[PDB]
Design a protein around this ligand. Structure first.
Ligand SMILES: CCCCCCC(=O)OC[C@H](COP(=O)(O)OCC[N+](C)(C)C)OC(=O)CCCCCC
Ligand SMILES: CC(C)CC(C/C=C1\C[C@@](CO)(COC(=O)C(C)(C)C)OC1=O)CC(C)C
Ligand SMILES: [Zn+2]
Ligand SMILES: [Zn+2]
Length: 52
């Protein structure tokens, strides 16, 4: 069952659960899965394994 990612706004240092680097920026820094809470970069979304 695929993840359900949404653009999200982080307020404390958060890493991409896919590629390991920081989600940089002030707002809209990445995507959070509605169902499991995984955080990923916008570009990493298509690369994550899609078993939520
Ligand atoms: C409020 C508010 O913060 O809006 C400002 C952000 C800022 O855009 P960003 O957070 O994407 O700036 C990039 C920061 N960094 C260079 C570290 C990646 O830009 C807008 O959303 C407008
Ligand atoms: C409250 C919100 C509207 C802004 C706030 C968000 C805080 C973040 C974003 C994040 C997420 O990984 C990445 O931070 C960065 O890239 C910075 C800190 C270098 C910008 O880590 C944080 O602690 C940041 C400002 C107070 C400077
Ligand atoms: Zn998920
Ligand atoms: Zn990433």
């Amino acid at each position: 069952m695929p993840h359900r990612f949404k653009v999200y706004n982080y307020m404390s240092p958060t890493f991409c659960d896919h590629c390991g680097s920081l989600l940089w920026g002030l707002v809209k820094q990445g995507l959070k899965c509605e169902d499991c809470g995984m955080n990923v970069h916008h570009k990493c979304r298509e690369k994550v394994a899609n078993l939520c």
